[PDB]
Every structure is written in structure tokens, then in C-alpha cells.
């Protein structure tokens, strides 16, 4: 059709590894022990300061681990030799991590006691309510269990359902169901996980807030939004990613209330009674996550990360790393209780009072290979317009102008004056990088060279220089 | 885990969940596998020690 394109385009954004040459240089790094440990339902606040007394630890909670990074240029030169500042700059690959998350078993579990359900609708034996009060009991539930992991450079965009403009034309306003729109934010830590009534902010969009557990009520939930994170062409939001989920029916159940929204009645044939309406419809799954399989797991495997999709393809930008991670499999919750005497020989809700916890253990190993980026002029001229402040943080790219004169005005308001002069105004405010809530990482100084010491070395030369020395053992183990 | 020494975050105290504090030590013959709330001495985590078998 009539005449479309033909395109003339005429310059083109190009891949970043194809005048990228590595280096044998390993060097070796990783944590102490991940480990917080927090309540599992809900948060818990001082009940006399403002501040946490527990934190909400749950692994149905994204655990976003921003690590921050330095260069290589910023750090170790082992020999010089063809390193030249001008001829080349160097950047981290890291080439293997290792996700640890060997813990004792437990599940993900919210619950509240005001969760809402009219009657049961998997099978019903009755006619339901047309209308009625204090349809709500103290029910609880996982969301579904929730294995995902995806590794980026950038931060990570998650979709949402937030309260769009409210409608007069399309008549989607309160009193009929609110508006939905959809918008993309950034995810957090302890941001919230899709609940299988869609990810979607509850805070403003559930007008009652009490239909489910609370923790979500106040927060947004979010569903990582893959296709637009693949869709740009760059490939840094991220470059990996892997799931695992499961929801099955536990059993239906109607959600009581009443809509106030049209319903076409040449539908049913009308009868006598209140059966000539219908009841309440707002049905709903309750999820399920009741089988572990402790057999089968996304984790307590390595991630050979040693290539990234995109025009990346295996540097850091940014010089970060961005890792999610839900896991509900092996989170566990522990039970105990504090007495208030052990000679009352009750079991009272003041006597003996029941408690429960989380504990939840990550660990992040690298393994970093060294590279080197070839610059020449027409390389610059592209990594400026890529992104101007890789070549400012480097400081090769930038040599002068700018500017940097003139001038100070004056001669001369010593005396007099307007008004005096003042200077100079230096914040708000970096950083952008750190303007949302994380699990924050510092990796700039546990970088070493070893590989034996460490089981992820080990493991890492199994693949690679083959070494480790293997077996491992095997034959036969089963 | 062990019964922890009292923190500000959380203390051995009424009203108030014990600290879980982790204790490494070697495989006893006829020592417990996990219950589902996992490792951790149950004797005097659980003061009223009739939550569990």
C-alpha cells in the first residue's frame, strides 16, 4: 500500500559487543550471610514510637537487591601492559553468581480476620443473600506459590492497576465498578506480589479496604511486566529471567455485596419469591499453593550470566546490578509463644500468647571476568548518545571545553548589594539510581581472585577450565 | 534456631516474640528432621510446648 515506507533511517543504534574483547582476569566475590528475619502477615510497629518493631519479612514479597558497583578502571589493574586509558576502558561482566537458599521448609502465608465471602459457590446446597451484614470471617490464604528470579542493570518496570480518570462518558466512577488503568512504575522491595485478583494498588481502588488481608491494601501489587521489558532494544532492564508458579482452585466462594451495576433480566425466566432476583455476582477463586515439591526449584543453582540479551552483551550500565527474587518454597515461619506464667495452668489469648515468625536466608556469590572496551572516536561519538555520563564517570571522552567562563557580575554589589549574593544552591539532588526502596548491597571490596575457597569457584571451573577438579562424586549417588 | 539474648527489634519478654538467634552444632544421633516451622529447638521456644508433638 500507497507508498509506505520506503525507509531512510539513516543512522542505527548498534549492539555494544562486537569491538569488546575479554579478559582471562577472574576475580572472585560474594556475602557473608543474607539473612533477615521479620513477621510474615503483617508489619508490626513499635506501639509507642512510629518506627518497625518487626519488619514484614515474606517471601510474597519481591526481594529487590540493588547492588551498586564500581568499575575496573576504579579499582585493581593486576599489570599494565596494553591498558591505556585512551586505547580502551574497562567494565565488570559478572560471569557467575551463584543464588543461595538452602533454608528448612516453611510456606509464604497472609491471612486476615475480616476476609470477605458470602457463601461457598464451588457447590452451594442453598439459595445466597441478596443482601445481608457481617459476611466475613477469619479467613487465610497464600496468594499462590511464587517462584521468579530475573537479573537486570537498570531498574525493573512492573505493571499495576491504579485508579484512572474516573468516567462520565464511559460512566466507571464509584457506585458501579471504580476505573482501571493501567500503569507501569518501577517494583520495590517490598513492594507486593500479584495476589491472583490481578496486581493491581488496593489502596485506592478498594473503597472498603477489608475485602482482602492488609498488607496489600496499603501497597501497590505489581506483575513484572516482561513484554515491555524485552521490548526495548538496549536490553538493560533486564537480560535473564526464569518462573515457576502454581495456582489451583482451592474452592470457589462469592464475594458478598452487591453490584450496582446493570444486569440484562431476559437472562432468567423470572419466578415468585426473591427468586425473582438474582443474587450476588463478584466470584471469586480462592488460590492455592498447598503442594511443596522441595525436589524441583529455581534456586540453590548457579546463574551463569555470562552473556546478556540486547545490544548488552554482558557489560553493566549503569555499573549495577538489579536482582528480584520471590521465593515462597523454603520461607520459614516458625511458631512459639512468650508465657505470661507457666503456674497458670490455662491456655488464654493473655496466657500463653501464640506468635509466629519469618526467617528468611538468601546468599549472592560472583564471579567477575574481566573485559575491556576498544574506544575509537566513532565508538565515542555512539556511547555519549547511548548515555554521556559513562564517558564523564570514566573521565576519557571528557577532556575540555566545557566551558567554562564567564562571568561574575559584580563590579560591583559589595556594597551594594541585591542581595548578597547568595551562593549556591547545591542540593535537591542526586541520586536518581537511589530514589526507591531496596535491599540495599554494597559490592565494591569484596572482590578477590580465589576459586578453590569458594564452592561457586568450584563449580565455576567445572565449566570453564576444567578443573575443579571434578567427579564430584558420582559415579552413582542414587 | 536458638532462643535468642533480647534485642530492642525483639526480646524474651511477654507481649513480645523471643529473638530467633542461629545455633550451629553437630548432627546428634536421634536429633529431629524439620516439622514444617523448621530447625529450632522447640523446649523453650514454645514455653507452653504443647503446640507441637
Known amino acids: 500500500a500507497t507508498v509506505y515506507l520506503p525507509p531512510v533511517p539513516v543512522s542505527k543504534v548498534v549492539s555494544t559487543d562486537e569491538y569488546v574483547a575479554r579478559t582471562n582476569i577472574y576475580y572472585?566475590?560474594?556475602?557473608?550471610?543474607?539473612?533477615?528475619?521479620?513477621?510474615?502477615?503483617?508489619?508490626?510497629?513499635?506501639?509507642?514510637?512510629n518506627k518497625i518493631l518487626v519488619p514484614k519479612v515474606s517471601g510474597l514479597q519481591y526481594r529487590v537487591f540493588r547492588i551498586h558497583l564500581p568499575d575496573p578502571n576504579k579499582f585493581g589493574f593486576p599489570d599494565t601492559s596494553f591498558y591505556n586509558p585512551d586505547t580502551q576502558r574497562l567494565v565488570w561482566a559478572c560471569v557467575g553468581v551463584e543464588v543461595g537458599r538452602g533454608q528448612p521448609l516453611g510456606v509464604g502465608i497472609s491471612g486476615h480476620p475480616l476476609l470477605n465471602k458470602l457463601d461457598d459457590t464451588e457447590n452451594a446446597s442453598a439459595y445466597a443473600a441478596n443482601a445481608g451484614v457481617d459476611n466475613r470471617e477469619?479467613?487465610?490464604?497464600?496468594?499462590?506459590?511464587?517462584?521468579?528470579?530475573?537479573?537486570?542493570?537498570?531498574?525493573?518496570?512492573?505493571?499495576?492497576?491504579?485508579?484512572?480518570?474516573?468516567?462520565?462518558?464511559?460512566?466507571?466512577?464509584?457506585?458501579?465498578?471504580?476505573?482501571?488503568?493501567?500503569?507501569?512504575?518501577?517494583?520495590?522491595?517490598?513492594?507486593?506480589?500479584?495476589?491472583?485478583?490481578?496486581?493491581?494498588?488496593?489502596?485506592?481502588?478498594?473503597?472498603?479496604?477489608?475485602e482482602v488481608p492488609l498488607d496489600i491494601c496499603t501497597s501497590i501489587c505489581k506483575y513484572p511486566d516482561y513484554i515491555k521489558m524485552v521490548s526495548e532494544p538496549y536490553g538493560d532492564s533486564l537480560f535473564f529471567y526464569l518462573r515457576r508458579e502454581q495456582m489451583f482452585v482451592r474452592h470457589l466462594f462469592n464475594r458478598a455485596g452487591t453490584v450496582g451495576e446493570n444486569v440484562p433480566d431476559d437472562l432468567y425466566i423470572k419466578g415468585s419469591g426473591s427468586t425473582a432476583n438474582l443474587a450476588s455476582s463478584n466470584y471469586f477463586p480462592t488460590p492455592s499453593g498447598s503442594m511443596v515439591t522441595s525436589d524441583a526449584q529455581i534456586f540453590n543453582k548457579p546463574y551463569w550470566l555470562q552473556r546478556a540479551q540486547g545490544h548488552n552483551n554482558g557489560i553493566c550500565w549503569g555499573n549495577q546490578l538489579f536482582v528480584t527474587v520471590v521465593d515462597t518454597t523454603r520461607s520459614t515461619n516458625m511458631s512459639l509463644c512468650a508465657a505470661i506464667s507457666t503456674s497458670e495452668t490455662t491456655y488464654k489469648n493473655t496466657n500463653f500468647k501464640e506468635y509466629l515468625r519469618h526467617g528468611e536466608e538468601y546468599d549472592l556469590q560472583f564471579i567477575f571476568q574481566l573485559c575491556k572496551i576498544t574506544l575509537t572516536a566513532d565508538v565515542m561519538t555512539y556511547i555519549h548518545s547511548m548515555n554521556s555520563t559513562i564517558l564523564e564517570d570514566w573521565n576519557f571522552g571528557l577532556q575540555p571545553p566545557p566551558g567554562g567562563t564567564l562571568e561574575d557580575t559584580y563590579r560591583f554589589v559589595t556594597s551594594q548589594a541585591i542581595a548578597c549574593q547568595k551562593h549556591t544552591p547545591p542540593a535537591p539532588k542526586e541520586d536518581p539510581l537511589k530514589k526507591y526502596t531496596f535491599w540495599e548491597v554494597n559490592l565494591k571490596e569484596k572482590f578477590s581472585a580465589d576459586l578453590d575457597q569458594f564452592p561457586l569457584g568450584r563449580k565455576f571451573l567445572l565449566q570453564l577450565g576444567l578443573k575443579a577438579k571434578p567427579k564430584f562424586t558420582l559415579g552413582k549417588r542414587k
Open 138 to 210: 477469619c479467613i487465610s490464604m497464600d496468594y499462590k506459590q511464587t517462584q521468579l528470579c530475573l537479573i537486570g542493570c537498570k531498574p525493573p518496570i512492573g505493571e499495576h492497576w491504579g485508579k484512572g480518570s474516573p468516567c462520565t462518558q464511559v460512566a466507571v466512577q464509584p457506585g458501579d465498578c471504580p476505573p482501571l488503568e493501567l500503569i507501569n512504575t518501577v517494583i520495590q522491595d517490598g513492594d507486593m506480589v500479584d495476589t491472583g485478583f490481578g496486581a493491581m494498588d488496593f489502596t485506592t481502588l478498594q473503597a472498603n479496604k477489608s
Open 28 to 49: 572472585h566475590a560474594g556475602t557473608s550471610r543474607l539473612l533477615a528475619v521479620g513477621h510474615p502477615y503483617f508489619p508490626i510497629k513499635k506501639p509507642n514510637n
